[PDB]
Design a protein around this ligand. Sequence first.
Ligand SMILES: Cc1nc2c(O[C@H]3CCOc4cc(F)cc(F)c43)cc(C(=O)N(C)C)cc2[nH]1
Ligand SMILES: *[C@@H]1O[C@H](CO)[C@@H](O)[C@H](O)[C@H]1NC(C)=O
Ligand SMILES: *[C@@H]1O[C@H](CO)[C@@H](O)[C@H](O)[C@H]1NC(C)=O
Ligand SMILES: *[C@@H]1O[C@H](CO)[C@@H](O)[C@H](O)[C@H]1NC(C)=O
Ligand SMILES: [Mg+2]
Ligand SMILES: [Rb+]
Ligand SMILES: [Rb+]
Ligand SMILES: [Rb+]
Lengths: 260, 987
Amino acid sequence: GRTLSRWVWISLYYVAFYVVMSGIFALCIYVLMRTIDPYTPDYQDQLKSPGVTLRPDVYGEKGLDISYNVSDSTTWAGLAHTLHRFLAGYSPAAQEGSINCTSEKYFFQESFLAPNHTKFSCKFTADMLQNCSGRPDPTFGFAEGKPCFIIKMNRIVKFLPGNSTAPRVDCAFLDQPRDGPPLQVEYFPANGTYSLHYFPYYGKKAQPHYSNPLVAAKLLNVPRNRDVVIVCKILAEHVSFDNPHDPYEGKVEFKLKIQK
Amino acid sequence: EMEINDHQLSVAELEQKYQTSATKGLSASLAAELLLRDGPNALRPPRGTPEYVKFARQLAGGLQCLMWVAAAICLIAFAIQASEGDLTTDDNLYLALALIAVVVVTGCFGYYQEFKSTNIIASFKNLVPQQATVIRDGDKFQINADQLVVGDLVEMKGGDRVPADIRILQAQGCKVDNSSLTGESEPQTRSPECTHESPLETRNIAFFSTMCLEGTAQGLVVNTGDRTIIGRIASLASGVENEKTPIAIEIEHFVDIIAGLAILFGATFFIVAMCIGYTFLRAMVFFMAIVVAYVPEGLLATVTVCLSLTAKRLASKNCVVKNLEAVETLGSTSVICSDKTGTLTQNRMTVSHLWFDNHIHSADTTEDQSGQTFDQSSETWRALCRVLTLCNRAAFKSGQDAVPVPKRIVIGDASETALLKFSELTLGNAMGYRERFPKVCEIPFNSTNKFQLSIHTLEDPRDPRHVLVMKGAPERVLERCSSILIKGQELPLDEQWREAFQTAYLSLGGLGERVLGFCQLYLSEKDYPPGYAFDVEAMNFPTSGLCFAGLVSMIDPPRATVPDAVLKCRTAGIRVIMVTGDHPITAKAIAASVGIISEGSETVEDIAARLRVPVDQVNRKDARACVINGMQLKDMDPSELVEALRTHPEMVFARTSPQQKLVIVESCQRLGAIVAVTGDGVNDSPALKKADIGVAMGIAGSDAAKNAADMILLDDNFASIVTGVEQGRLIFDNLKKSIAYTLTKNIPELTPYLIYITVSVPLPLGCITILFIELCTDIFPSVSLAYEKAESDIMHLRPRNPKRDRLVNEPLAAYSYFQIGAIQSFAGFTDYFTAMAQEGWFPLLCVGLRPQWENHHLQDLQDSYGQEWTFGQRLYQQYTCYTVFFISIEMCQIADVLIRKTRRLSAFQQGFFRNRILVIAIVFQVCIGCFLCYCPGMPNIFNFMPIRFQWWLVPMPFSLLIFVYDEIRKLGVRCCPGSWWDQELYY
Ligand SMILES: Cc1nc2c(O[C@H]3CCOc4cc(F)cc(F)c43)cc(C(=O)N(C)C)cc2[nH]1
Ligand SMILES: *[C@@H]1O[C@H](CO)[C@@H](O)[C@H](O)[C@H]1NC(C)=O
Ligand SMILES: *[C@@H]1O[C@H](CO)[C@@H](O)[C@H](O)[C@H]1NC(C)=O
Ligand SMILES: *[C@@H]1O[C@H](CO)[C@@H](O)[C@H](O)[C@H]1NC(C)=O
Ligand SMILES: [Mg+2]
Ligand SMILES: [Rb+]
Ligand SMILES: [Rb+]
Ligand SMILES: [Rb+]
């Protein structure tokens, strides 16, 4: 409708308008990523308490659901393989860029002392689960019906879980008291504890080869051919495990069915 | 077809057809039987108005179809999404639900508003049953008019309303008031003799709604109810269908605009959605998300409350409107087709001029008496005043002292009534005064004597003599006068004076006025002593050789505030046309005096008068004014009429039928104008309905004119019409402001979405919050632009060209969407990436990260600092992105309103806080914004969270940028009126 020599002036105006505005946006991100530090989050407002995940993680609907047949290895090979490929990065061969750690308490690294301005991160290799390492049982206790679920807490730069005793994992059911014993769970390493010299996290740029501490909760007492539900809560002084809008901070819940 | 032959039948033929008698009427039996047969003698009101269908009507319109379509799109999209297992499809139900919600809440708002209009107008109409002097079985009794049946015999006197369509059988001195059917302001005489074959122009038919002024008649009813002339004209009027209002057309134009953009954007992004490896199903779900985001959820509510506030303003001035659309119509109006008798004029015979002391004095013809009276000091004036006061039988009805004189009811003849009100305003307590001059002899008006006369004894006992006072047609009084009261003496009435009387008589005649001559003589106390036995038959008093007092002449004068209202409409560029059913002479009289015909403008007839050449010779282009009577109008065609219309600008239609008023409104309307009709009587209901807006008088107006009208002037103040133009021109201009404002925020709620599609970054702006924006935070600041006053001299502007000047145009719409909305979305994304980075996520990480973002099966998702987030956590971070983009919106919106206060003028010129209600709305805006963020529990109920005060300040640079941008748009358009900067950047 407009004149063609106008049309080009109009569109040159809108083109030039967008270029100027995008440019403002450009200089804004430019400034914006300079206003912030690569080794700590400015605010970390949502990470008040840390979340805790579980392996093998398989869901159906409405949270974690895990069922399998001891007699049908097709139902549990996939879980075992989840655990193998997950721990493939906790092998000594892939995790050689760290230090053997025995600090036994908080590992505050005040100054940057590792190659190419990096940081020293502790080492945590599979063999520290001792039964659930993939050896000497490559089914991680599933074949037996004593499954090894490995628990792993979320990492937050410069977060401290408590100084009293090491943060431990307590796995238990909820409404199965009446008929049947309480559960018996063996943890690896023992008491289901996390070594305090793994805190604090200084961030993916500071520690390029960092690896979370793990505890495996080998479940022995769990009844076969029955629907049960297991919660692994974390016990420390600065961990809140129970909040209604996030059921994965401090605890994990999963439905377990082992059938024979 | 019954009535075209009724007035031509012989009396035997009528009493045959109707099984009646002309002397003793129907029998009671057959009269009751006929009443069952034909039904009540009254007009059937509008029946088809079921209470639920009135409400259902309110759920259709431009925005209502838009919103309904969009409601529906939500639901088929919801079906698709739940089909492919998509979660949180709650949002689709929420949105489509609220779309329907605003439609119905506004629907019942408008329903209340119209119901309250109908109650207010029905609160002003009289509900007492009219009556009828009927004669049945040879008995003359009174009954309700609605119990008359065809064939009945009825009677009429002075002041009786004509109860049916009557065929005159016998009549003495009977004249009547036909101003609601014909325009005719002069009383029309009724006689039993067939004057014409058209029942409209015959003199032997009395029409159903009319009023007997004087005299007495008796006749047969030949049609009752909807079959009468009244019933036919009003059934025609409800036969015409009224077109769609200008404002409704404009809203339906921009829903076409919004829809065009919407399906364009939906479409191009649907193909772009497929080329990113999206399912055809999901690709089309995004198509629908888009076209529905283009729909402004809240605009319909704002438009209505804008319109009801101006309805409130107009209603406070006693001007009621039935529908809100009719608020604007006056502003866009280009032509006004106006009735004469009863709208422009008061429809009341008023004393306009007197001739005495050798001079034509001109009285005050207004109803609040704001005009200028005449010289009431002369002795001869006092003599004349005594004559006209004492020679009158008219009488005021009881208990009217509160109400103004012109508004009082009077028991009297046509010209006697006018003269009574004259001495009552002049002399004060007219009938009390004339009681002090006791009346010994009286002769009433008749054709034998041809005058009216009375002899009186004087007021003090010092004066024993008598005074005779006479009035009549000026020549028939002048033949009986021998002297004349001039300048305090009684001079002999010579040939110089005879000629002068005659020239003044004719002078007042040519203005179309009814003129009477008055005169007096003092009978000697010698010849006529107290107690003297005056006999009329044997003329023992003198009937000739009287002394001439003066001439008095009456007219149907304009309503007090009408001439100046016409002047103020014409300065605003509105072409005023008169369509009157009255004869041409009085039409052009009024037309000239009220401003339809300017001083120094003349028709071809008036030209050929001073150029002394045959009218056909004078040039038609040279005549500015023109009068066209109904006979000539019927011989013309559309082609002749349009040339006749756009050759003579000051035009006047005399002797025009209701259909012809319709016709002229139609020719105007097809020539592209927005016609507004102003009317009182039932000869306007057709033209009133066909008009873009029909204005009826609330007092003089008829039930058909009032029903066909979109607007009612309850006080009958014709100057409310000029209030309508400015108010209607105002809110149009305020709507351009307000609609533009509310549309501009649509782009910065759509863009985060469609980048959340293409660049797949976590969702910046969530549905439930853009609802809070559209329906909660910005409705108050939008309707505040109702109150911006004009930026020009709004009332010296021309009517807007309905083709160029539109509520939204491609310039306005495209400017407001893609420049200002673009800037707001850029402030959004800036606050977005900031709230990310400060909380963990880098701009280049956000690209592509939506899939794992929304993924409920990750609980260890790693930000750019390597930290591990659960789902509920990054959910809250997305809610923070909501709230940060939301307040990024609102800050640019505090700026948007101030930009939209003005379209041409700088905000410094007119000020920032001129509009009080706009600032109280901006403070309201910010504090609920804060309420939604920092109130306890808001992250859970809604998707709003307490943001850190760092991010409030991040968009303020952008809002200042727009303030500067449009100020420079407005400074460069105002200081540089050149077309380049104007057309491309103006709205
Ligand atoms: C501009 C925009 N539209 C959005 C949206 O639309 C959905 C739900 C409501 O209605 C329809 C209708 C449709 F036809 C198609 C659709 F896809 C939708 C959802 C969200 C949101 O809250 N999400 C969590 C994605 C955010 C949006 N922003
Ligand atoms: C752990 O520390 C001990 C103590 O010297 C050492 O023998 C061992 O080699 C260390 N582990 C590794 C993997 O080097
Ligand atoms: C762990 O392994 C050792 C050696 O096989 C064994 O003694 C111990 O009982 C195991 N624990 C469990 C819970 O199987
Ligand atoms: C376990 O597997 C065997 C072989 O597949 C089958 O017969 C048995 O019923 C399974 N147990 C259950 C509870 O399904
Ligand atoms: Mg009229
Ligand atoms: Rb929208
Ligand atoms: Rb005067
Ligand atoms: Rb109308």
